[PDB]
Design a protein around this ligand. Structure first.
Ligand SMILES: [Mg+2]
Ligand SMILES: [Zn+2]
Lengths: 1292, 49, 48, 586
RNA sequence: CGACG
RNA sequence: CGUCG
DNA sequence: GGGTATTCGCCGTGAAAGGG
DNA sequence: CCCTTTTTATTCACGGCGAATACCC
């Protein structure tokens, strides 16, 4: 085990061993930006594909070529720790190298005159940190992914939703990556129409005539040609045995003396078998079958040159008589059917007079541009750049792959441009669906949805910026002069900077990250939202879009969705779920070869899951890779069925593959309902870190992955020993085998102390290692917020009993004792931010100088000679912190709002280059330079001692070595002075501000919020509720030992809501506390070591084939006492979500710790002091605290400010406003009488600016009488309707 | 709050609430469909007076 | 009236104003452009 | 229509079980903020402050002088409590607030069934009336003691939800053997003394001497003394029951509907004044005995039937045999799927019946020699049988198998969930349940907005109908009769014509005489004669067949289902009708 | 005017 | 129903 | 010579920014 | 404080009401 696991071993109850380790949870955010940053020689992904899509460019009649050479990212002057406290954007400059050449005259491939190569800077791109965040304006920002539809071709349908008839209607839809859509819909009248970008209707012959196709090159593709020949008597057609099945007998079918089908006889298999056996070619057809066919090709004459008839006409008797008497030997037609084929092309050709390509182009230009008149050349250019241009219509490799996979093509590579045969193959696939031999697809399948990360959205925004820059330089180079000045200032970096500031700033997917919990940060980073730019609308969603498809096994967690307006669209990614190359999702599966489960894994996509059969993870093995049972449940194509032993092809990896990392931390997940687990997973994300976060007794084991995967703790980069322990920094000296020959030496880890998060929650990192402790790589060093020795510690645990206690737990309420208040458990520190902006002001600018009027004599004792409040003074809401004067004397001092009272802990002063503070910012700069000097002195004292040891060990070869080390010491002191000057220029540099401000001071207040009746506390199973009354200690129930119960819950929610996993969690916590009390009983008195080690070995060997298998014989005598100290408060239990502990193991753990089997001990009353008639279920449960404090909800207003557009009070808590009296409250008042109640509600309290003052004066003088008055909102409405051309007045 | 102002118009214009009222008031008062009123108001065709 | 359309002077790089005041300013601008156009004996298509 | 108001607040609701029905709990800071001009006027009239500015400086400095002045203004001044979703008239009620310590409002548990507000972090708004007429309208019309009936039907809305009904079910129950069985007592006070002393049990068959009062005479109440075999808990609860009710309402099982029928009988016999004290005394006794009960859940309370695995084995054998018969080529799949789902439904019903028979009969207690079988004292069975919290289907899904989980597209999978919530589950028995849960959550999240839009459309249709007349006189009407769908009855004759004036005389099929006059009200005594005569159809005046111009009269409507008398003139009944229609639409 | 519960 | 700009 | 059934669209609710 | 030219082209459910082509006597 590692050094962290040897401090406290968490007992596991899993019966099945794991084969694949849990990977990095932030891999979907880190690898995409890593591929976006680095360069690739193929130019497929990253900035190379964005620069290759624009470059090279060529101007018309200019002979100027601006090509691409290379590029290189720059280093920022500020790190991550400085932009979070300064306010600047953490970004890096982009350095690109271009080359502009010029050709000669009348030579397109001539020689050059001169080369123009330089280094051009185009904008600063924001760099991603190691945690996956972006510092835009001093706040860490996380851009979530986007779940959109993959580019290609799909087939939708409606179940008679448009027409009143009961039938089906199919439609094809082509979705490109960047271009126009192409809809091919049907009709109930058997027609085809084309819809492009939701424009007007257009038949399919116009898009076919515009692709250089004649009439004879259309009907031969969708139908089979039938050729008639002239014989002596009873002229005949050819016969196919597979083309006369499903039609009634129209005549007497007879050939060569044997009757096949008589008159009115249905075709059976024997008649068609005899027809296939005979296969004769001379069979006659009578004359009434000729007129039912149509014309396929127009008949031309070889003697007179005159046409007989046109194309797609009706066959008549005079026409066939003229065709027989003229000499036309070949008579062509097509085949008509009702159950096998369909004459849709013949029906489409008779609903519009469009015959040639000219009228088709006129109709195209009329549908595209209804205002401009049609023409020939511009319409041809429009049809050229609609679908046959890579600059306006381009697809990626995933679009070409989905286009070729839907049309049964073996090629998965293409050019990304549409051709003429693609529409033919789409229409041929669409006809077979309507005919009956086709199948329909679905949108909700995960094989048709694609996840777009930030590395593709940033590439698209950079491509938009690059095409804007090349359009601007193309419009500039059309009239500018050449070989004049170096191409460095002609490229404007302002559109690219504006594009990346619009993308990384105000965007639908670029939202803030709530830093109230590390699990909340991990869930926000691993968030797959279907909304955003290029997706769908939340208000325009339906039933099936919010519904989850059964193909979401292992890729989407089914119990983590925000309930409310957007449920099923902001779903999270699972644990073992990984992205694909094209942008799909894949899950690992154990390969099963001839019954032997191989330990290797294979990632299968969504479309590859249904092609194979996958078994379940809950399958017993005989310790050899074989199945101990013959019949096992599997899944074939989306349903559960029983399969054999040989037919098993794959197997799941683990039981935690379906749920995410937010739902994996809930113990006993299989005993809870889906809604209760969903509410518990939603409330676990809203956890608030307490003062002393302690370990959970009943856990899962993935809390360490949440602790070490999120950047909220401090881990060791290289293994070594700890040299200096402090609350501010940690000095660790590395070992010899990991020491680089060119490195600086030891490593210094800085600890953030009392910083402000995005949710006004205090976060800090406290160290846990001792002085002189050996650590290794990957070991934790400091516990951050909600961290206990490298484990996620959300809330606290206490005694929980399920009994009704005098109605204080009626619906969902929680009765908490005073022992929780006295032990300082649920106290939370909150840090707020108060700023003061001093801008320009005419006739005296805003300053923070002395002699501020309208003050008191007590305000001078709290402020300095300047006016800034001291750090560490307890203030009250309504005092004066920053006294700012505004000459116009007018006072504009910053005051504290009522309702908050904290302590000033940090004052940040940001001054410009014009006005510099003399006593506030200068001492901050001195403290930062002193801290940096102390850090570099502590880092180089070891190197100075090593150089002193070297000069003592060394002191001609020895004289040359002495001169070598002497000049090395001179070079070391020279680079020391250079590094000191660089640090002095870096710290004392300054910053840039907005144009208009002078200086910005910020005061941080730290308020200590305790637990009070009115707060909201819950658990991990969905037992939400509030606190009613803080009960005393002597009033709470107690056992025979006298220990009072801290929290009394309500057992009425157990039959109503199906969450009984909390009862198993309470019993397991009671057993763990009994084991911890039996351990602590051997530590309160003087005991030995071997008996305690034997009891620890007995506590870790319950049996039932566990996978922990610890060995206490290898532990020394110094670590056993530390383990007993860490286990004297309770032993942590690891319980997976589906491989959890059974009830018999809980009964054995209860019997081991001298506890009863049922777990219900008899409790006595606290007030009266008598035994209850029934035993009460009492134990230990892990409770949490939500961010629904009662101090942020209570608000009251009697008199306040009003609006200016209307005479109505305001609304909210930050502004002094009142509550809203909605229309339903007016309806409820109208249900009663409430005449004078409604007269005073909306006329006296809101309107009547001269009447409410009279009402206030009447209340002051002691008169409860009001006036009706006149509402001002009705006067505003009367003035608003009179502003139009409508007159309205009042009549008397 | 009760004092108002007025803006004169050198060229006359039509109203919107009496044009797209479904049915139109001008389309009901005159013997004309709505598309010809849109053609005259958007300067597409003349009318003989 | 201007009291029904409040215009609070904000502090920043851009100016905060109402959309109805901008629409009325555009209407007055178009009316003043038409008034300047009628005083120059303009042809039919430009006044159209 | 919707404006922001002054003198209003908003906080988090709290139970506060020590309060009464006509009062609530208000914090000191909210009572000091919402009553600033009243405190200023009291300081001006008492002659303590010099001016209004001195009173403001005395208020905002947190002095101990204006604290007892608040006891004179928050004594007889009611406030208007309101929830943010409002569906009908019971969402806005009036309470007399008291001064508590904290930052939360204490909402009474008896009005939580009308407010539909649980204590999982819900918020409510409070308003302060200013006009004297507004205070008198809040006291006389919008009070919580005056609005105890539902606006849609004549049923009481003040019902014990989960805890008081569980306490009254645990206190009043029959046992076969307990401490102190077979002794006769002299009164209920001796039974309460024996229960408090510990010499006798709570659930024991004893004999007490009770005196019940009847009101068969006009002007006085007679009394009768009898000795009945009852329980000690029923003898304790008899002291809560006043003299107007007999002993037949106490000696029953006292489930959920029994307390509602007892409160309805107390309202229809005594009135409004003794009922609001009786409901508070019932709630106090239930909250007092809920701590003495000590009901808890656990692992041994959810029993498992030992014959469940045999039924599962024969069901799996039958599915395997019918699958072999399908694969042999005998029965097609379209009937085999129906046969599989039918035998799985039969096996689920057999497992549910075995689980119910194991739950209701599991405890045997001996008396003398041989043993006896009675109703079990299990906690989950006591919470499910009394109707406290949870229906029988959730207990069937908890202990026994939950059945078949259907697909959201319309179909249902032929294999059900074998294991229950007590046993372990795999990921295959947890996927379709999440599908159905997400479907139900999206369905309720869309249908609550659809119901809100429906009731918003439905209020504005009948928003201008005020009763302006008392009697008009019409000869037309509707033919009121209980409809028959084809099977048994669904709505009886008593709940269709209760409180409505008939149109003409009813013809008797037997003797053909006149029963009722034309313009008369149908109270609770004429319906007994109407069901004893066994009439077919009664010509009753309706709202549609009225003749009053611009509104209806007091006779074409009938009873307002809120009071025992007729509806007064000038009541906007259309808004109440739209609110009672739009409320259970969710 | 958008995000979140 | 609130928070933010 | 003359008219309403069927269908298909439109509306109701929940092309203009850049420098001097 | 003012003109112009090369193409930003972006996706609900259900119901009420108005308008251009047609078969039959
Ligand atoms: Mg609630
Ligand atoms: Zn009437």
């Amino acid at each position: 085990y590692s050094y962290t696991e040897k401090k406290r071993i968490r007992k596991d109850f899993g019966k099945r061993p794991q084969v694949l380790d849990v990977p990095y949870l932030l891999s979907i955010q880190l690898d995409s930006f890593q591929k976006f940053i680095e360069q690739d020689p193929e130019g497929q992904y990253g900035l190379e594909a964005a620069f290759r899509s624009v470059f090279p460019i060529q101007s018309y009649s200019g002979n100027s070529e601006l090509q691409y050479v290379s590029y290189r990212l720059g280093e920022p002057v500020f790190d991550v720790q400085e932009c979070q406290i300064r306010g600047v954007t953490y970004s890096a400059p982009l350095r690109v190298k271009l080359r502009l050449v010029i050709y000669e005259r009348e030579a397109p491939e001539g020689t050059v005159k001169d080369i123009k190569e330089q280094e051009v800077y185009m904008g600063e791109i924001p760099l991603m940190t190691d945690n996956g965040t972006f510092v835009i304006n001093g706040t860490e920002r996380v851009i979530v992914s986007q779940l959109h539809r993959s580019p290609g071709v799909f087939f939708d349908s409606d179940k008679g939703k448009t027409h009143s008839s009961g039938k089906v209607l199919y439609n094809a839809r082509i979705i490109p990556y960047r271009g126009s859509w192409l809809d091919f819909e049907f009709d109930p009248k058997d027609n085809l129409f084309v819809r492009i970008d939701r424009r007007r209707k257009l038949p399919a012959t116009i898009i076919l005539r515009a692709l250089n196709y004649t009439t004879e090159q259309i009907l031969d593709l969708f139908f089979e040609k039938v050729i008639f020949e002239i014989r002596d008597n009873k002229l005949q057609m050819e016969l196919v045995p597979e083309r006369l099945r499903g039609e009634t007998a129209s005549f007497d079918i007879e050939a060569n003396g044997k009757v096949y089908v008589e008159k009115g006889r249905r075709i059976t298999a024997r008649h068609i078998r005899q027809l296939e056996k005979d296969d004769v070619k001379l069979i006659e057809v009578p004359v009434e079958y000729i007129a039912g066919k149509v014309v396929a090709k127009d008949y031309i004459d070889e003697s007179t040159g005159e046409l007989i008839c046109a194309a797609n006409m009706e066959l008549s008797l005079d026409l066939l008589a003229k065709l027989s008497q003229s000499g036309h030997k070949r008579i062509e037609t097509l085949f008509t059917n009702d159950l096998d084929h369909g004459p849709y092309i013949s029906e489409t050709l008779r609903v519009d007079p469009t015959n040639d390509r000219l009228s088709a182009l006129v109709e195209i230009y009329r549908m595209m541009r209804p205002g401009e008149p049609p023409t020939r050349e511009a319409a041809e250019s429009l049809f050229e750049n609609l679908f046959f241009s890579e600059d306006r219509y381009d697809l990626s490799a995933v679009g070409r792959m989905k286009f070729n996979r839907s049309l049964l093509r073996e090629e998965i590579e293409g050019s990304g441009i549409l051709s003429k045969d693609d529409i033919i193959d789409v229409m041929k696939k669409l006809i077979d669906i309507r005919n009956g031999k086709g199948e329909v697809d679905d949108i909700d399948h995960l094989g048709n949805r694609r996840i777009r990360s930030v590395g593709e959205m940033a590439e698209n925004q950079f491509r938009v910026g690059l095409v804007r820059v090349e359009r601007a330089v193309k419009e500039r180079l059309s009239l500018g002069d050449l070989d004049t000045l170096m191409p460095q200032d002609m490229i404007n970096a302002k559109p690219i900077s504006a594009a990346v500031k619009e993308f990384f700033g105000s965007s639908q997917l670029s939202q803030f990250m709530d830093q109230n919990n590390p699990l909340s940060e991990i869930t926000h980073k691993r968030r797959i939202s279907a909304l955003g730019p290029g997706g769908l609308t939340r208000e325009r969603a339906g039933f099936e879009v919010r519904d989850v498809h059964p193909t979401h096994y292992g890729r989407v967690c089914p119990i983590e969705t925000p309930e409310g307006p957007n449920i099923g669209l902001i779903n999270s990614l699972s644990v073992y779920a990984q992205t694909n190359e094209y942008g799909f999702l894949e899950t690992p599966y154990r390969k099963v070869t001839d019954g032997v489960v191989t330990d290797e894994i294979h990632y299968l996509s969504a479309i590859e899951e249904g092609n194979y059969v996958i078994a379940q993870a809950n399958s017993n093995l005989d310790e050899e890779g074989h199945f101990v049972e013959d019949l096992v449940t599997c899944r074939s194509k989306g349903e559960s069925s029983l399969f054999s032993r040989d037919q098993v092809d794959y197997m799941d990896v683990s039981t935690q593959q379906v749920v995410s990392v937010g739902a994996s931390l809930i113990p006993f997940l299989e005993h809870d309902d889906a809604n209760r687990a969903l509410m518990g997973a939603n409330m676990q994300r809203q956890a608030v870190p307490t003062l002393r976060a302690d370990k959970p007794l009943v856990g899962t084991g993935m809390e360490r992955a949440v602790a070490v995967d999120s950047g909220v703790t401090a881990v060791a980069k290289r293994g070594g020993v700890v040299q200096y322990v402090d609350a501010s920094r940690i000095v660790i000296k590395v070992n010899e085998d990991e020491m680089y020959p060119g490195e600086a030496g030891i490593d210094i880890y800085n600890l953030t102390k009392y910083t402000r998060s995005n949710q006004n929650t205090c976060i800090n990192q406290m160290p846990c290692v001792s002085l002189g402790e050996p650590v290794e790589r990957g070991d934790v060093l400091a516990d951050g917020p909600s961290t206990d020795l490298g484990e996620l510690a959300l809330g606290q645990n206490m005694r929980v009993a399920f009994m009704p206690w005098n109605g204080y737990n009626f619906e969902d309420s929680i009765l908490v004792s005073e022992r929780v208040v006295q032990e300082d458990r649920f106290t939370t520190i909150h840090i707020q931010e108060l700023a003061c902006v001093s801008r320009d002001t005419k006739l005296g600018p805003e300053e923070i100088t002395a002699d501020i009027p309208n003050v008191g004599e007590a305000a001078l004792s709290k402020l300095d000679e300047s006016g800034i409040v001291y750090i560490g003074a307890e203030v009250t809401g309504g005092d004066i912190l920053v006294g700012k004067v505004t000459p116009k004397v007018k006072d504009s001092s910053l005051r504290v709002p009522n309702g908050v009272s904290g302590t000033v802990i940090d004052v940040q002063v940001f001054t410009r280059d014009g006005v510099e503070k003399d006593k506030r910012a200068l001492e901050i700069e001195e403290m930062q330079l002193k801290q940096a000097k102390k850090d570099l002195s502590e880092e180089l004292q070891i190197l100075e001692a090593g150089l002193f040891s070297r000069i003592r060990a060394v002191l001609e070869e020895k004289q040359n070595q002495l001169e070598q080390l002497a000049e090395q010491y001179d070079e070391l002191k020279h680079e020391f002075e250079k590094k000191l000057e660089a640090k002095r220029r870096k710290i004392t540099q300054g910053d840039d501000l907005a144009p208009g401000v002078l200086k910005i001071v910020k005061v941080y207040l730290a308020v200590k919020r305790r637990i009070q009746p009115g707060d909201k506390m819950a658990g991990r199973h969905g037992n939400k509720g509030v606190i009613s009354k803080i009960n005393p200690i002597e009033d709470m129930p107690y056992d025979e030992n006298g220990t009072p119960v801290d929290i009394v819950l309500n057992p009425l929610g157990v039959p109503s809501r199906m969450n009984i996993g909390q009862i198993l969690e309470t019993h397991l916590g009671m057993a763990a506390k009994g084991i911890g009390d039996k351990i602590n009983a051997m530590l309160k008195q003087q005991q030995e070591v071997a008996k305690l080690r034997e009891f620890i070995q007995r506590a870790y060997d319950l049996g039932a084939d566990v996978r922990q298998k610890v060995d206490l014989s290898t532990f020394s005598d110094e670590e056993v006492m530390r383990l007993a100290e860490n286990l004297r408060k309770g032993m942590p239990i690891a319980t997976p979500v589906f491989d959890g502990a059974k009830e018999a193991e809980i009964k054995e753990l209860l019997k081991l710790g001298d506890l009863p089997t049922s777990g219900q001990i008899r409790l006595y009353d606290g007030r009266t002091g008598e035994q209850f008639e029934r035993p009460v279920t009492v134990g230990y449960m892990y409770m949490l605290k939500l961010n629904h404090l009662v101090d942020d909800k209570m608000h009251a207003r009697s008199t306040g400010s009003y609006s200016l557009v209307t005479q109505q009070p305001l609304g909210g808590k930050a502004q002094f406003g009142g509550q809203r009296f909605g229309e339903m409250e007016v309806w409820a008042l109208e249900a009663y009488g409430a005449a004078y109640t409604l007269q005073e509600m909306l006329t006296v309290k809101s309107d009547d600016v001269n009447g409410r003052t009279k009402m206030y004066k009447n209340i002051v003088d002691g008169n409860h009488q009001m006036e009706p008055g006149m509402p001002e909102s009705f006067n505003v409405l009367l003035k608003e309707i009179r502003s139009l051309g409508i007159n309205i007045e009042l009549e008397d | 709050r009760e004092r108002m102002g007025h803006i004169e118009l050198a060229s006359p214009t039509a109203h919107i609430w009496f044009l797209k009222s479904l049915p139109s008031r001008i389309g009901l008062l005159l013997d004309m469909p709505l598309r010809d009123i849109e053609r005259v108001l958007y300067f597409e065709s003349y009318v003989v007076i | 009236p201007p009291d029904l359309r409040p215009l609070v002077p904000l502090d920043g790089g851009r100016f905060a104003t109402s959309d109805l005041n901008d629409l009325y300013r555009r209407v007055i601008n178009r009316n003043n452009r038409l008034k300047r156009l009628l005083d120059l004996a303009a042809p039919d298509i430009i006044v159209r | 229509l919707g404006k922001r108001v002054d003198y209003s607040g908003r906080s988090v609701i709290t139970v506060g079980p020590y309060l009464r029905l006509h009062q609530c709990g208000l914090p000191k800071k909210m009572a000091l903020e919402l009553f600033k001009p009243f405190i200023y006027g009291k300081l001006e009239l008492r002659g303590l402050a010099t001016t209004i500015k001195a009173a403001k400086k005395m208020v905002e400095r947190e002095e101990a002088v204006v604290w007892d002045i608040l006891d004179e203004v928050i004594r007889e001044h009611p406030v208007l409590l309101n929830r943010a979703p409002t569906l009908h008239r019971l969402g806005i009620q009036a309470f007399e607030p008291v001064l508590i310590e904290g930052k939360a409002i204490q909402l009474h548990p008896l009005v939580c069934a009308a407010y539909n507000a649980d204590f999982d972090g819900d918020q409510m708004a409070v308003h302060v009336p200013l006009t004297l007429e507004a205070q008198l309208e809040a006291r006389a019309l919008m009070m919580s003691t005056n609005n105890i009936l539902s606006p849609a039907n004549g049923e009481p809305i003040i019902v014990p939800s989960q805890d008081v009904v569980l306490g009254l079910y645990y206190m009043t129950r029959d046992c076969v053997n307990a401490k102190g069985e077979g002794m006769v007592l002299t009164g209920p006070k001796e039974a309460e003394r024996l229960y408090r002393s510990g010499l006798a049990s709570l659930h024991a068959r004893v004999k007490v001497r009770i005196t019940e009062y009847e009101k068969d005479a006009n002007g006085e109440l007679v009394a009768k003394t009898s000795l009945k075999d009852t329980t000690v808990g029923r003898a304790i609860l008899w002291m809560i029951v006043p003299k107007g009710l007999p002993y037949s309402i106490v000696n029953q099982a006292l489930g959920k509907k029994a307390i509602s029928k007892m409160l309805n009988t107390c309202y229809r016999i005594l009135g409004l004044k003794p009922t609001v004290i009786f409901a508070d005394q019932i709630m106090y006794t239930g909250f007092a005995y809920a701590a003495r009960s000590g009901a808890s859940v656990g692992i041994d309370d959810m029993v498992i039937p030992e014959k469940k695995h045999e039924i599962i084995s024969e069901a799996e054998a039958e599915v395997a045999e019918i699958q072999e018969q399908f694969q042999s080529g005998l029965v097609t799949a379209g009937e085999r799927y129906n046969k599989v789902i039918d035998i799985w439904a039969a096996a689920n019903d057999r497992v549910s019946k075995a689980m119910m028979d194991n739950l209701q009969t599991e405890t045997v207690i001996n008396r003398d020699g041989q043993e006896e079988k009675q109703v079990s004292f299990n906690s989950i069975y006591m919470m499910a049988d009394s109707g406290a919290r949870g229906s029988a289907a959730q207990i069937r899904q908890l202990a026994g198998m939950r059945g078949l989980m259907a697909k959201p597209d319309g179909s249902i999978i032929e294999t059900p969930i074998t294991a229950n919530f007590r046993e372990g589950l795999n990921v295959l028995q947890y996927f379709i349940s999440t599908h159905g849960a997400r479907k139900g959550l999206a369905d309720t999240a869309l249908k609550t907005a659809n119901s809100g839009y429906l009731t918003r459309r439905l209020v504005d249709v009948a928003q201008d109908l005020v009763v302006t007349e008392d009697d008009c006189g019409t000869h037309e009407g509707i033919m009121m009769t209980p409809v028959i769908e084809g099977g048994d009855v669904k709505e009886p004759l008593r709940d269709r014509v209760l409180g409505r004036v008939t149109a003409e005389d009813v013809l008797k099929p037997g003797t053909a005489d006149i029963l009722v006059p034309r313009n008369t009200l149908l109270h609770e005594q004429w319906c007994d004669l109407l069901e004893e005569n066994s009439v077919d159809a009664v010509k009753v005046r309706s709202v549609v067949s009225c003749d009053t111009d611009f509104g209806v009269c007091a006779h074409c409507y009938g009873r307002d289902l809120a009071r025992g008398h007729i509806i007064n003139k000038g009541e906007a009944i259309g808004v109440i009708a739209a609110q009672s229609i739009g409320e259970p639409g969710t």
